[PDB]
Amino acid sequence: EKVTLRISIEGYPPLYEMEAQDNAELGMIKPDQLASLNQALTKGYTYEDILIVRFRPESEIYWPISQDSRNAMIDKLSRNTSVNFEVSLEFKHSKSWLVPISLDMTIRAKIQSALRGDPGHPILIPQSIPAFIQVPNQGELTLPTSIGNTIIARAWFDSLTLNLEQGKSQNEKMWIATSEHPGDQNAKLWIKTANTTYSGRPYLQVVGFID
Ligand SMILES: [Pt+2]
Ligand SMILES: [Pt+2]
Ligand SMILES: [Pt+2]
Ligand SMILES: [Pt+2]
Ligand SMILES: [Pt+2]
């Protein structure tokens, strides 16, 4: 089984790439976690069907973008119409979501500054990654619309926040990615996410339902 996540400004080398290969234990999911999830909704899938995928939030390779391509990317924001991009791949089955970057200039200026690497400038990509995804035998991944419609790109999606590592050499550019839920981040519906042993940061998490 294999999962990759990629987060980028469309057209350009990803800010963030991560590979999952859960990780990593024999069981797909904690067996209280489906009883606490199933109860929180108040679908017929069993523990062997539910995968908890966890992405290390630091990109797995340094950002390899050329300065010129990076400059071009920033300039594109100076005028109009660009979209955030991200993709999930198992393992054959993929989905990519496009999230429009607001034409609001005070925030386009915030992205631009973040892309330049200024301290104190995250890149908010709101409602951009699903906490839950469904992977089928044929075709691209799908959303569990049932789960979505209960919660309140799509409205129930998690939001992303991306930061460039500060103080590193020009050939060592890391984006770090953080996630959070819309509304109550503490809701029981959310399978709680783990942190990493090596860095102490939260995993990027998606719960997959397998067919
Ligand atoms: Pt197994
Ligand atoms: Pt198992
Ligand atoms: Pt600023
Ligand atoms: Pt780093
Ligand atoms: Pt940090």
141 Cα: distance to centroid of ligand 2 (angstroms): 22
Residue 85: cis peptide before it, omega within 30 degrees of 0: no
Tell me the CA–centroid distance for residue 162 and ligand 5, in Å.
Answer: 11
Residues near 43 by Cβ (< 8 Å), separated by ≥ 6? 146
Measured between alpha carbons, how far is 58 from 32 in angstroms, rounded to an integer? Answer: 29
Q: What is the phi/psi pair of residue 70, to 5°?
A: -65, -40
The experimental method behind these coordinates is X-ray
Give the span between the Cα atoms of 67 and 114, in whole angstroms: 14
d(CA 194, CA 133): 18
Resolution, expressed in angstroms to one decimal:
2.5
Q: Is 165 exposed, middle or buried (0-12, 13-18, 19+ CB in 10 A)?
A: middle
| Cβ–Cβ < 8 Å for 125, 7 | yes
| Contact of 19 with 4, CB cutoff 8 Å | yes
Q: For the chain, which residues make up each domain, given as ranges? A: 1-211
Distance of alpha carbon 91 from alpha carbon 149, whole angstroms: 27
Residue 84 alpha carbon to ligand 4 centre in Å? 22
DSSP H or E stretch at residue 40: helix 33-41
Cα–ligand 2 centroid distance for 47 (angstroms): 7
Instruction: Indicate the SS3 state at residue 58.
Output: strand
In the reported structure, the alpha carbon of residue 119 is separated from the centroid of ligand 5 by a whole-number distance in angstroms of: 12
Continuous H helices in 79-211: 105-116, 145-151
Closest CA to 179 of 163, 164, 167, 166: 163
Q: Is 173 helix (H, G, I), strand (E, B) or coil?
A: coil
Nearest to 181 by CA among 164, 149, 154, 156: 156
